[PDB]
From Swiss-Prot, chain A:
Protein name in the entry: rRNA biogenesis protein RRP5
Something else known: Present with 8860 molecules/cell in log phase SD medium.
Function: Involved in the biogenesis of rRNA. Required for the formation of 18S and 5.8S rRNA.
Residue windows of the HAT repeats: 1-31, 105-138, 176-208, 210-245
Subcellular location, record wording: Nucleus, Nucleolus
Gene (name only): RRP5
Organism annotation: Saccharomyces cerevisiae (strain ATCC 204508 / S288c) (Baker's yeast)
Residues of the full protein shown: 1457 to 1721 of 1729
From Swiss-Prot, chain B:
Name recorded for this polypeptide: U3 small nucleolar RNA-associated protein 22
Designated gene of the protein: UTP22
Protein task: Involved in nucleolar processing of pre-18S ribosomal RNA and ribosome assembly.
Species the sequence originates in: Saccharomyces cerevisiae (strain ATCC 204508 / S288c)
Pfam families linked: Nrap, Nrap_D2, Nrap_D3, Nrap_D4, Nrap_D5, Nrap_D6
Subunit comment: Interacts with snoRNA U3. Interacts with MPP10. Component of the ribosomal small subunit (SSU) processome composed of at least 40 protein subunits and snoRNA U3. Interacts with UBP10.
Native organism taxonomy: Eukaryota, Fungi, Dikarya, Ascomycota, Saccharomycotina
Swiss-Prot record, chain C:
UniProt organism field: Saccharomyces cerevisiae (strain ATCC 204508 / S288c) (Baker's yeast)
Assembly with partners or alone: Component of the small ribosomal subunit (SSU). Mature yeast ribosomes consist of a small (40S) and a large (60S) subunit. The 40S small subunit contains 1 molecule of ribosomal RNA (18S rRNA) and 33 different proteins (encoded by 57 genes). The large 60S subunit contains 3 rRNA molecules (25S, 5.8S and 5S rRNA) and 46 different proteins (encoded by 81 genes). eS1 interacts directly with uS11 and eS26, which form part of the mRNA exit tunnel.
Function: Component of the ribosome, a large ribonucleoprotein complex responsible for the synthesis of proteins in the cell. The small ribosomal subunit (SSU) binds messenger RNAs (mRNAs) and translates the encoded message by selecting cognate aminoacyl-transfer RNA (tRNA) molecules. The large subunit (LSU) contains the ribosomal catalytic site termed the peptidyl transferase center (PTC), which catalyzes the formation of peptide bonds, thereby polymerizing the amino acids delivered by tRNAs into a polypeptide chain.
Additional notes on this entry: Present with 92400 molecules/cell in log phase SD medium.
Protein name: Small ribosomal subunit protein eS1A
Residues spanning the signal sequence: none
Subcellular location: Cytoplasm
UniProt modification remark: N-terminally acetylated by acetyltransferase NatA.
Family assignment from sequence similarity: Belongs to the eukaryotic ribosomal protein eS1 family.
From Swiss-Prot, chain D:
Gene field: RRP7
TM region positions: none
Summary of the function given for this chain in its UniProt record: Plays an important role in the synthesis of 18S rRNA but is not required for the 5.8S and 25S pathway. Is necessary for the cleavage at site A2. Is required for efficient association of RPS27 with the pre-ribosomal particle.
First-listed, main subcellular location of the protein, grouped into a coarse class: nucleus
Flavoprotein found in the keyword field: no
Annotated source species: Saccharomyces cerevisiae (strain ATCC 204508 / S288c)
Subcellular localization: Nucleus, Nucleolus
Protein known as: Ribosomal RNA-processing protein 7
Length: 261, 1090, 116, 241
C-alpha cells in the first residue's frame, strides 16, 4: 500500500500524466497537513504534466480549487482562480468552481458571484443559469429564481430564449411550481407547436412530476395538434407504454382511425 | 575558511574510535611485553653449532645475502633480555581504520654489551640480528604453544619496510579470546643502541665494506636502527608545543594512503618510499626551521589546516632533491642550504642520517608534483574540492593514476646466472652501492628510462608486481620461483606519465656534432649505437639523433622502450602490452595516404578540410550580393576536431560529412517580420549565392536541403556545397531578427504552449547562437589539451557501440570528455588515450545527478568563472532541480561560461537512455576493478551489449559502406580500397541517398512518432561498428513502464492498439514491427524478439 | 578577446555631408557625439569579445565592422567613412606552439642522410 | 480473440492487412472509428479514427473506400484528413503566432465527406465491416498499398528542385509584400475613429496588430518638509524620541 512519499514519487515517475494519483499524493501531503508544500507539489504537477491532457489538467484544477476552498485563504483562492482563468478554459472552470462551492455549502458570497459571473459571461452560456436557478429553487428563493428570468430574457437572444425558459420550466417542474413552469411553456406552445422534442420532454416532465389529469390533457391534445406519420406512432409508443407501466382501447381506436383519416 | 573546518572535523568523525578497540590489543601487547620481560637469556655461542641447533628444529633463520661462511666468523653472538619500547604511532594515538590494519611501533632495543666499535661493516651485525630474531621468535612460539592460545594467534616473518636488511615479526591473528575486529597486525622490530659513533663512519659518504663508493641503504638502515629515539622525544615535545599534530598526521595519512605512498620503499621497485612517519618528522622540523634565514616556518599556535598547507607548500615549491635541502638537529636553528646531494634529502646534525633516503629521485619528483598540484587546488577559492582532495582512492585502480603501463616479462633465472641473462654489471662494487639484484635492476631501469626518453615523459615510476614480503618462518627468504627467475617479482611493471606535447615527436635530437667528440656524444653513441646517426636539420646544424618510424596502432614510446631495454637490461626481456594496441585502433583508420603510418595526434585531415573551407571562404566573400556577407564562420564537428572518423575527401556516407558553416549578413532593417517570410528570404539569398556559384565557379557544386531539427518551420532550407577538394559544407544563414522573432513568439503565445515553445527556442539557440561560442572555446582548448580529440573520437565510438547517439547529442559527449581534461583534481591532465578514456568512464560512473552539477571553466592551464558567477550557477542548479524533483526530463545539467543555463545541450533525451548510460558506466568501472585490465576485458567492454530488451531489428542496406565512408578495415591490400573509394562526386545528384544510409532519419521519425510509448535507439555511424564489411545496424528500444501490462483505452492513450479485451487493450507488437518492416523492406532483413 | 589577448582597438569616424544639404557646416551636436561613441564602443566591444584573434583578423581584413558601424549608427547621424585604424596588443597569453602551428599547417622535421 | 466488433464507448474496430515480410508470415492493423461533427464547415459529417497507420494519407483513404465501394457498393467520396499531425510537426503555428497573415485533438484523423447520407451509409457499412472482420479474417475488406511513404519519406536525402522552390519563393514574396504594404498604409492612414478621435500611430510602424499587441504588452516627488503640519509632525517625533 502506498504510505511513503518515496513510493508516491516512484508512482508519479512511473506515470506522470495520471492526475488521479497526482492529486492523491497531494492529498497525502494534506493528510500530513502541509498546504504550502501541497501547493509546491501542485505547481510541480503543473510544470511536469504533458499540457495536451486537458482532462487530467481539469482534475488538477479540481485539486487547486479544493485546496484553496477548504484550507487556504480566499485571497490565495482568487489568486489561483486568476491564474486558472488565464491558463485554461474559463467558463468550465467557473462552473466547476461553483460546483465545488455548492458541495462545500457556501451560499452568501456564492449568489453575489453568481451575479458577477452572469455579468461577465452569463449572456451566452447556459450552465450558469442551470446552477443558479437550481440552487435558488432548492434553497427556497422562488421569487429570486423567477426574477432571474428578466435578466435571462435580457441577456439571451431569440436563438437561446427557448432553451433557457425550457430548462427553467424543467427545474420548476422538478423542484418548483408546475403552474409556473406551464405558464412559461404555453407561450412556446403558442409560438411553435410543430416542435416535437420539446413537446415530448414536456409530457415526460409531466409524467415524472405525476399530474394525472394534466398528462391526460397533454396526451389527448398532442394528436389534435400537428402530427405527422412518425410523430403519431412515436407519441403512441410513449403513451401506451406510459399507461401500461378503462382508457387504453379509447386511444387504440384513434391510433388506427388516424392512419385512415 | 568557514566550511573547511567543518569538513576537517567531519573527516575526523569518519574515524573516531580510538578508545574502544584500542584497549584489547593493548592488553594483548601488555601480556606480550610481560612475556618478553620474563624471557630467559643466553650467553655467547658459535655459528657452527647454532646452525645445527636451528637445523634440527622446524624454525630456520633468515639472512642478508649471503649466509656467513665460517672463514670470516669472528663475531661473538648473544641472546640477551632486550629493553622493550612501545613507541611511535599508537603511543601517540593517531588511529586509522584500515582493511590491512595499522601497527604499533615496538622495538626490542639492543643491550650495550653485544656490540663493539666496528658494527658498521660486512653485515655481521645484521647476521646477529637475524639469528637473534630467529631464536627469540622460536622462544616466543614455544611460549605461545605452552600457554595454548595458538588457535587464534599466529606469527610471521616479514621485512621492515620491504627491506631485506631488517626482517621483523608480524604478529597477527586468524578466525572468547580471538582478535579479528581491529588492525590485524603489530610489528616487533629489533634495533641497535643510540650512542654508537660519529658521522664520518655513519654518513652515506663513506665505505669500509670490501670492493670508496657510497653505502646509502646500509648506513641508513643501521643508523635508523640505532638512533631513532630523539625523533620520539622531539615528537612529544612538539606534541607539548601544539595539539594539532595528531589531526595533522591522520590528515597526512589519509592523503598519502590515497596517493598510495606507503612506507615500503621506492628503491625496491614499488610505489611509496615516502612515509607518514617521515611526514610527521618533516612537519615537526618545519615548525621550527625551513626558512632561508632559518626562520620559524610554521608557528606552533595555529590549527592543523594551516600547518598542513604549510608543509605541502614547503615540499611543493621549495626543493629538497636537486638545488637545496634542509639540515636540522633534534638536540639551535635548522638551516636550509642551497646545495643538493642529488638525492631526496634532509640532514640531521644530532642524528646524522638522511630520513628521506627510503625514496628515490623519481618518487620525490612525483611527490613534489603532487604537492604542487594539491597546493594549487587547495589555494583556489571559487570552488572547494575537499571531497576531491581527501575522498578519492586514486591508488585502487593504478592505470587511472598513470598515463600508460608496460610489462617486463624476463626469465633471468639464478643469482649466479646473472651474466648471460642480463647486460648490466656484477660485483661487490655495485653490491655495496646497492643491496640486491632487483634493487640495482630497478635503479638501472630508472636511469635507462629517463635517458631513453628525456623530456618526452613527465614522470617515471617502476614497480615489481609479484613481490611477496610475507615469507614464512621455516624458509630463509622468500624463496619463490616467480615465473622464470628465483627473485621476488612475477614481472616488472613500468608506468609513465608523459608530456603530451612532444610525446610523439618522431626524431629525438641528442647532442650537437663537433670535431672534438664530447662526453655526452660518447654517452649517446654507446647508449643507442646501431640506430644512432648524425643528421643535418633544415636550419643547418648537425645533431646526433634517432629516427622513429611512427605508427597509428602504437605510440613510438613503445618501440623506444623496447629497443632501449633489449639493448641494456636483457636481450630476452620481452615487453608485453596489448591494451594500447587494442583500443588505440578502435578509432576508425581514415583511408588517407599513409595514415596507418602516421600518428594519432596528427590533424592533417582536419587541416586539409579547413584549407578547402578557406578556398570556399574567399570565393563566397569576393562575389557580390544585394546585402553582403558580414561574417561567415564554421561551427562544424570537423572544425572543432571532434568528428568520429577523420574527414577523408569524397566520403558521402558518413553522417558527420556535411559540416555546418553559418553566415550572418549585414544588420539591415529591411528583413521581413514573420518567421516563414524571413526564412523564405534566407532561401532567396541562398538561391542567389548558388546561382552565382554555378555561374562563375563551375568546379564547385551546390544542392539544397530541407531541415527539420528546428521544429515547427518546415521551410528552413540550407544549401550544401560539394567542393572539388572532396568535402561538403552545409550553409545556414543567421539573421539579427531571429532570436527576437522567437522571443516575440514566446511572449505572445498562449499560456500553455510556453514550455513547448521554450524547448523550440532551446533547440534554436543550441544550433545557431551559442554553438558558435561553444566551438570557438573548445577549438581553442584543443591545442593545450592534446589528447582531447582522440578521447572524444573514442568516446563517440564507444557510445555508438553501446547505442546512445540517436537520442544523445555531440555537445554532452564533448563536455563530458573535457571534464577530466580541465579538472585534474584527483589525477593529471591525461596524456594517453587509455588514461583519458577510462578517466572519462570513471568520472561518469562517479557522476551524481541530484547533487553533482557539471560546472566547467574552459581555460588553458595556469579566463575562468568568477565567484559570483559560480554562486549564480549553483543557485540556478538548486532552484532548477528543487522545482524539478528528480529529473523526469532534465537528467543532465552541464554549465560552462558559454552557457549559464546548463540545460542547453542535455534537454530532450529520455530517462531510460540517461540511466542506461550511468548504469553502463558503473558496470564498466566495477568490471575493470575486478576482472582486471586486459585485451579480452577491453573487447568485452566494447561488445555492443544488446541486453535484449523487447526487440532487435537488423538492417541491411545493399552496400557495405566502408568504401563510401572512407575507412580502411585494416585490409592488407591498400589498392583494393584505393580503387574502391569513389573519389569523384557523381554527375547526377539524386544518387546520394542510395549511396548514403537512411537509418538515422528512419529511427528519428519513428522515435518522434512513438515518442510516448516506446523509445528507439540505433547506430548511426555504420562503417565503424557495422561489421568488418560495414553493413549492419540495429533498431533496439525500451517499452514504457506504463505500457508493460494491458491498459484501458481512451481517446488519447497514444498507441497502436490490439483490442482483445473490450476495454483493456495492448500494443500490437506484430503490427508495429510490420509497419517498421513496411517502412524498411529494402532496409531491414531480420527481426529478433526477447 | 575569447583568448587572453587584450586589445586597445581604435575607431575613427567622420560626419557625412548629407545629400540635399545646403549649410556648409555638418557639425555634430556633441550630445550626439556621446551617443555615437557609446554605440560604437559597445558594438565593437561585442565584435571583439565574440571572437578569437584569428577570427578578428579574418573579419577585420574584408573591412566589415566598418559597414556594421555604419549600418547600426546611420540611425542617429549620416556618418562618412568609418575606419578602425589601430589595434594594439597589450598582453599575450602564452606561446601554445601547437596552436601557432594550427594557424598555418602542421609539420614534422625529420631525417636527412648522415653519409659519414 | 478477433471476434470483438464494437468497443465500449461507441468506437468501431476496423483492422487491416500486412504485406509480405522477410521474417513473418498477422494481417491486422487496428483502428477505431466514430461519427461526429462540430459547428464549422471543415468538420461537418466527420469521422474520428484513432490509431491511424503510419502515413495513411488521402490517397490511401481513396483506395480503402474504393475497395469498400467495391464490396458493399455504398456512397463514399473522401476529400481531406484534418488534424493529420501524427508526427509532431504542426501542433503550434509560428506564422499565426507572430504574424498577420493566416491569423489563428491527439494522433487522430478527422475525415469529412460530401454528404450526411454518405457518412451514414459508410458508418453502417463500417459496422457490418467490423462484424465480418470479427467473424472471419479471410473474406475481409482490405486497403492496398502503393506507398507514398516509398515515394517521399524514405529518400529524404534529396536535392530540392530549383524551379520548384524558385517559383515558390516568387509567389510567396509576391503575396507577402503586397499584404505587408497594404497593412502598412492601412495603419499609416487610419485617422477616423467613430467618435471624433485620431489614432496616434508613430512613424514607420507597419501594423495595427503590432501597435495593438504592443499596447497590450505595456500593461510622485513629494517633500518631507515645507508644510506646517509636516514640520509639526517632525518636531513632534523629535520631542517624543
Amino acid at each position: 500500500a502506498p504510505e511513503s512519499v518515496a513510493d508516491f514519487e516512484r508512482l508519479l515517475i512511473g506515470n506522470p500524466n495520471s492526475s488521479v494519483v497526482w492529486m492523491n499524493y497531494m492529498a497525502f501531503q494534506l493528510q500530513l497537513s502541509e498546504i504550502e508544500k501541497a501547493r509546491e507539489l501542485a505547481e510541480r504537477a503543473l510544470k511536469t504534466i504533458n499540457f495536451r491532457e486537458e482532462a487530467e489538467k481539469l482534475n488538477i484544477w479540481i485539486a487547486m480549487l479544493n485546496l484553496e476552498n477548504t484550507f487556504g485563504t480566499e485571497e490565495t483562492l482568487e489568486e489561483v482562480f486568476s491564474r486558472a482563468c488565464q491558463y485554461m478554459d474559463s467558463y468550465t472552470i467557473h462552473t466547476k468552481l461553483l460546483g465545488i462551492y455548492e458541495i462545500s455549502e457556501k451560499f452568501d458570497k456564492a449568489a453575489e458571484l453568481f451575479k458577477a459571473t452572469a455579468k461577465k459571461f452569463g449572456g451566452e452560456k447556459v450552465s450558469i443559469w442551470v446552477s443558479w436557478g437550481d440552487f435558488l429553487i432548492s434553497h427556497n428563493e422562488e421569487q429570486e429564481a423567477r426574477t432571474i428570468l428578466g435578466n435571462a430574457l435580457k441577456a439571451l437572444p431569440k436563438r437561446n430564449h427557448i432553451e433557457v425558459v425550457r430548462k427553467f420550466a424543467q427545474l420548476e417542474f422538478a423542484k418548483g411550481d408546475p403552474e409556473r413552469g406551464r405558464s412559461l411553456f404555453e407561450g412556446l406552445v403558442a409560438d411553435a407547436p410543430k416542435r416535437i422534442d420539446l413537446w415530448n420532454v414536456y409530457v415526460d416532465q409531466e409524467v415524472k412530476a405525476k399530474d394525472k389529469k394534466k398528462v391526460e390533457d397533454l396526451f389527448e391534445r398532442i394528436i389534435t395538434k400537428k402530427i405527422t406519420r412518425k410523430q403519431a406512432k412515436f407519441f403512441f409508443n410513449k403513451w401506451l407504454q406510459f399507461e401500461e407501466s378503462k382508457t387504453i382501447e379509447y386511444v387504440k381506436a384513434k391510433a388506427t382511425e388516424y392512419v385512415a383519416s | 575558511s568557514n566550511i573547511f573546518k567543518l569538513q576537517i572535523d567531519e573527516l575526523l568523525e569518519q574515524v573516531k574510535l580510538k578508545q574502544k578497540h584500542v584497549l584489547k590489543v593493548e592488553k594483548f601487547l601488555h601480556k606480550l611485553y610481560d612475556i618478553l620481560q620474563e624471557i630467559p637469556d643466553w650467553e655467547e655461542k658459535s655459528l657452527a653449532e647454532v646452525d645445527s641447533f636451528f637445523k634440527n628444529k622446524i624454525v630456520s633463520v633468515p639472512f642478508v645475502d649471503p649466509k656467513p661462511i665460517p672463514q670470516n666468523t669472528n663475531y661473538k653472538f648473544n641472546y640477551k633480555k632486550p629493553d622493550i619500547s612501545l613507541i611511535g604511532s599508537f603511543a601517540l594515538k593517531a588511529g586509522i581504520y584500515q582493511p590491512n590494519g595499522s601497527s604499533i611501533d615496538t622495538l626490542l632495543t639492543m643491550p650495550k654489551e653485544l656490540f663493539e666499535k666496528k658494527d658498521f661493516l660486512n653485515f655481521r651485525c645484521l647476521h646477529k640480528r637475524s639469528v637473534y630474531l630467529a631464536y627469540l621468535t622460536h622462544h616466543l612460539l614455544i611460549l605461545l604453544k605452552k600457554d595454548k592460545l595458538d588457535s587464534f594467534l599466529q606469527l610471521e616473518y616479514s621485512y621492515f619496510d620491504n627491506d631485506p636488511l631488517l626482517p621483523i615479526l608480524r604478529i597477527s591473528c586468524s578466525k572468547d579470546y580471538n582478535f579479528y575486529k581491529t588492525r590485524f597486525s603489530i610489528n616487533l622490530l629489533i634495533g641497535f643502541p643510540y650512542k654508537v659513533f660519529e658521522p664520518k663512519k655513519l654518513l652515506p659518504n663513506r665505505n669500509c665494506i670490501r670492493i670508496l663508493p657510497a653505502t646509502p641503504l646500509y648506513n641508513f638502515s643501521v643508523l635508523s636502527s640505532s638512533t631513532h629515539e630523539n625523533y620520539l622525544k622531539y615528537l612529544y615535545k612538539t606534541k607539548k608545543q601544539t595539539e594539532s599534530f595528531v589531526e595533522a598526521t591522520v590528515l597526512g595519512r589519509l592523503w598519502l594512503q590515497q596517493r598510495g605512498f606507503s612506507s615500503n620503499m621506492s628503491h625496491s621497485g614499488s610505489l611509496g618510499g615516502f612515509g607518514t612517519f617521515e611526514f610527521t618528522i618533516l612537519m615537526a622540523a618545519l615548525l621550527n626551521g625551513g626558512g632561508i634565514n632559518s626562520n620559524k616556518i610554521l608557528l606552533h599556535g595555529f590549527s592543523s589546516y594551516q600547518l598542513f598547507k604549510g608543509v605541502i607548500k614547503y615540499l611543493a615549491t621549495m626543493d629538497l632533491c636537486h638545488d637545496g635541502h634542509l639540515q636540522f638537529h633534534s638536540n639551535p636553528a635548522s638551516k636550509y642550504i642551497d646545495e643538493g646531494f642529488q638525492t631526496p634529502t634532509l640532514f640531521d646534525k644530532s642524528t646524522k642520517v638522511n630520513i628521506l633516503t627510503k625514496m628515490t629521485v623519481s618518487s620525490y619528483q612525483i611527490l613534489k608534483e603532487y604537492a604542487g598540484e594539491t597546493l594549487r587546488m587547495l589555494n583556489n577559492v571559487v570552488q572547494d574540492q575537499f571531497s576531491n582532495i581527501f575522498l578519492t582512492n586514486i591508488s585502487r585502480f593504478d592505470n587511472l593514476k598513470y598515463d600508460l603501463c608496460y610489462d617486463v616479462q624476463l626469465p633471468l633465472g639464478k643469482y649466479n646466472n646473472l651474466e648471460t641473462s642480463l647486460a648490466a654489471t656484477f660485483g661487490s662494487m655495485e653490491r655495496v652501492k646497492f643491496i640486491t639484484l632487483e634493487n640495482f635492476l630497478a635503479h638501472k631501469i630508472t636511469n635507462v628510462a629517463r635517458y631513453a626518453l628525456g623530456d618526452r615523459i613527465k614522470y617515471i615510476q617502476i614497480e615489481m608486481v609479484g613481490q611477496k614480503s610475507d615469507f614464512p618462518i621455516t624458509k630463509r627468504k622468500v624463496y619463490s620461483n616467480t615465473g622464470g627467475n628465483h627473485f621476488n617479482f612475477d614481472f616488472v611493471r613500468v608506468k609513465l606519465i608523459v608530456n603530451p606535447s612532444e610525446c610523439d615527436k618522431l626524431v629525438t635530437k641528442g647532442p650537437a656534432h663537433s670535431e672534438t667528440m664530447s662526453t655526452e656524444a660518447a654517452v649517446f653513441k654507446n647508449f643507442w649505437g646501431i640506430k644512432s646517426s648524425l643528421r643535418r636539420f633544415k636550419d643547418g646544424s648537425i645533431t646526433h639523433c634517432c629516427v622513429w618510424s611512427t605508427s597509428s596502432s602504437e605510440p613510438i614510446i613503445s618501440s623506444i622502450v623496447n629497443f632501449a631495454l633489449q639493448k641494456h637490461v636483457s636481450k630476452k626481456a620481452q615487453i608485453s602490452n596489448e591494451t594500447i594496441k587494442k583500443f588505440h585502433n578502435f578509432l576508425p583508420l581514415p583511408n588517407l595516404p599513409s595514415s596507418a603510418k602516421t600518428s594519432v595526434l596528427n590533424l592533417s585531415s582536419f587541416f586539409n578540410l579547413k584549407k578547402s573551407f578557406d578556398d570556399l571562404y574567399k570565393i563566397i566573400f569576393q562575389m557580390k550580393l544585394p546585402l553582403s556577407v558580414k561574417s561567415i564562420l564554421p561551427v562544424g564537428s570537423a572544425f572543432r576536431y571532434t568528428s568520429l572518423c577523420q574527414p577523408v575527401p569524397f566520403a558521402y556516407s558518413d553522417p558527420d560529412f556535411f559540416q555546418d558553416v553559418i553566415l550572418e549578413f549585414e544588420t539591415s532593417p529591411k528583413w521581413p517580420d514573420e518567421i516563414t517570410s524571413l526564412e523564405k528570404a534566407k532561401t532567396a539569398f541562398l538561391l542567389k549565392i548558388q546561382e552565382e556559384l554555378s555561374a562563375n565557379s563551375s568546379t564547385y557544386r551546390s544542392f539544397f536541403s530541407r531541415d527539420e531539427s528546428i521544429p515547427y518551420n518546415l521551410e528552413i532550407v540550407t544549401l550544401n556545397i560539394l567542393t572539388p577538394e572532396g568535402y561538403g559544407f552545409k550553409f545556414r544563414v543567421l539573421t539579427e531578427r531571429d532570436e527576437i522573432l522567437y522571443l516575440r513568439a514566446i511572449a505572445n503565445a498562449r499560456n500553455e504552449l510556453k514550455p513547448e515553445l521554450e524547448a523550440t527556442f532551446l533547440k534554436f539557440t543550441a544550433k545557431y547562437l551559442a554553438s558558435v561560442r561553444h566551438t570557438r572555446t573548445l577549438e581553442n582548448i584543443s591545442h593545450s589539451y592534446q589528447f582531447y580529440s582522440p578521447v572524444v573520437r573514442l568516446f563517440k565510438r564507444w557510445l555508438d557501440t553501446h547505442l546512445l547517439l540517436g537520442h544523445i547529442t555531440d555537445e554532452l559527449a564533448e563536455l563530458i570528455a573535457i571534464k577530466p581534461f580541465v579538472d585534474p583534481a584527483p589525477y593529471f591532465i591525461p596524456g594517453s588515450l587509455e588514461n583519458g578514456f577510462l578517466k572519462v568512464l570513471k568520472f561518469i560512473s562517479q557522476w551524481n545527478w541530484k547533487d553533482d552539477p557539471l560546472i566547467l571553466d574552459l581555460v588553458k592551464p595556469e579566463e575562468r568563472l568568477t565567484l559570483a558567477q559560480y554562486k549564480g550557477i549553483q543557485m540556478n542548479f538548486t532552484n532548477l532541480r528543487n522545482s524539478d524533483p528528480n529529473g523526469t526530463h532534465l537528467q543532465f545539467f552541464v554549465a560552462s561560461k558559454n552557457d549559464p543555463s546548463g540545460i542547453l545541450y542535455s534537454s530532450g533525451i529520455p530517462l531510460p537512455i540517461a540511466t542506461r548510460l550511468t548504469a553502463l558506466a558503473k558496470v564498466a568501472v566495477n568490471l575493470l576493478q575486478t576482472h582486471g585490465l586486459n585485451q579480452q576485458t577491453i573487447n568485452l567492454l566494447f561488445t555492443p551489449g544488446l541486453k535484449d530488451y523487447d526487440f532487435v531489428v537488423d538492417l541491411r542496406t545493399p552496400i557495405g559502406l566502408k568504401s563510401s565512408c572512407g575507412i580502411l578495415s585494416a585490409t592488407e591490400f591498400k589498392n583494393i580500397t584505393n580503387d574502391q573509394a569513389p573519389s569523384n562526386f557523381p554527375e547526377n545528384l539524386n544518387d546520394l541517398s542510395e549511396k548514403m544510409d537512411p537509418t538515422y532519419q528512419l529511427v528519428k521519425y519513428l522515435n518522434l512518432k512513438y515518442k510516448n510509448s516506446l523509445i528507439l535507439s540505433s547506430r548511426k555511424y555504420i562503417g565503424v561498428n557495422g561489421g568488418e564489411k560495414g553493413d549492419k545496424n540495429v533498431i533496439t528500444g525500451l517499452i514504457k513502464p506504463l505500457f508493460k501490462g494491458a491498459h484501458k483505452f481512451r481517446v488519447n492513450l497514444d498507441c497502436n492498439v490490439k483490442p482483445v479485451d473490450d476495454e483493456n487493450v495492448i500494443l500490437n507488437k506484430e503490427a508495429i514491427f510490420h509497419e517498421i518492416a513496411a517502412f524498411g523492406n529494402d532496409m531491414v532483413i531480420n527481426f529478433e524478439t526477447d | 578577446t575569447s583568448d587572453d589577448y587584450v586589445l586597445r582597438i581604435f575607431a575613427i569616424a567622420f560626419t557625412r555631408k548629407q545629400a540635399n544639404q545646403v549649410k556648409r557646416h555638418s557639425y555634430a551636436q556633441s550630445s550626439h557625439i556621446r551617443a555615437i561613441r557609446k554605440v560604437i564602443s559597445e558594438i565593437l566591444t561585442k565584435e571583439v569579445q565574440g571572437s578569437t584573434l584569428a577570427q578578428l583578423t579574418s573579419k577585420l581584413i574584408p573591412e566589415v565592422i566598418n559597414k556594421e558601424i555604419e549600418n547600426a549608427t546611420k540611425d542617429i547621424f549620416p556618418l562618412q567613412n568609418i575606419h578602425v585604424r589601430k589595434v594594439k596588443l597589450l598582453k599575450q597569453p602564452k606561446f601554445d606552439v601547437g596552436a601557432l602551428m594550427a594557424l598555418h599547417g602542421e609539420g614534422s622535421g625529420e631525417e636527412k642522410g648522415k653519409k659519414v | 480473440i478477433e471476434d470483438i466488433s464494437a468497443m465500449k464507448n461507441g468506437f468501431i474496430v476496423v483492422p487491416f492487412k500486412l504485406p509480405d515480410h522477410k521474417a513473418l508470415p498477422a494481417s491486422l492493423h487496428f483502428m477505431f472509428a466514430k461519427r461526429h461533427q462540430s459547428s464549422n464547415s471543415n468538420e461537418s459529417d466527420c469521422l474520428f479514427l484513432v490509431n491511424l497507420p503510419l502515413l495513411s494519407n488521402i490517397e490511401h483513404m481513396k483506395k480503402f473506400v474504393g475497395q469498400l465501394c467495391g464490396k458493399y457498393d455504398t456512397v463514399s467520396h473522401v476529400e481531406e484528413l484534418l488534424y493529420n499531425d501524427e508526427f509532431g510537426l504542426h501542433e503550434v503555428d509560428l506564422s499565426a503566432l507572430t504574424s498577420d497573415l493566416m491569423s489563428s485533438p491527439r494522433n487522430t484523423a478527422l475525415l469529412k465527406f460530401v454528404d450526411a447520407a454518405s457518412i451514414n451509409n459508410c458508418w453502417n457499412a463500417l459496422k457490418k465491416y467490423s462484424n465480418l472482420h470479427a467473424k472471419h479474417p479471410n473474406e475481409l475488406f482490405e486497403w492496398t498499398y502503393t506507398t507514398p511513404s516509398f515515394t517521399t519519406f524514405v529518400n529524404f536525402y534529396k536535392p530540392l528542385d530549383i524551379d520548384y522552390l524558385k517559383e515558390d519563393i516568387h509567389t510567396h514574396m509576391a503575396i507577402f509584400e503586397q499584404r505587408e504594404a497594404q497593412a502598412q498604409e492601412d495603419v499609416q492612414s487610419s485617422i477616423v475613429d467613430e467618435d471624433g478621435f485620431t489614432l496616434v500611430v508613430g512613424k514607420n510602424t507597419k501594423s495595427l496588430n503590432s501597435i495593438r499587441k504592443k499596447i497590450l504588452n505595456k500593461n510622485k516627488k513629494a517633500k518631507k518638509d515645507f508644510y506646517r503640519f509636516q514640520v509639526r509632525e517632525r518636531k513632534k517625533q523629535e520631542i517624543n524620541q
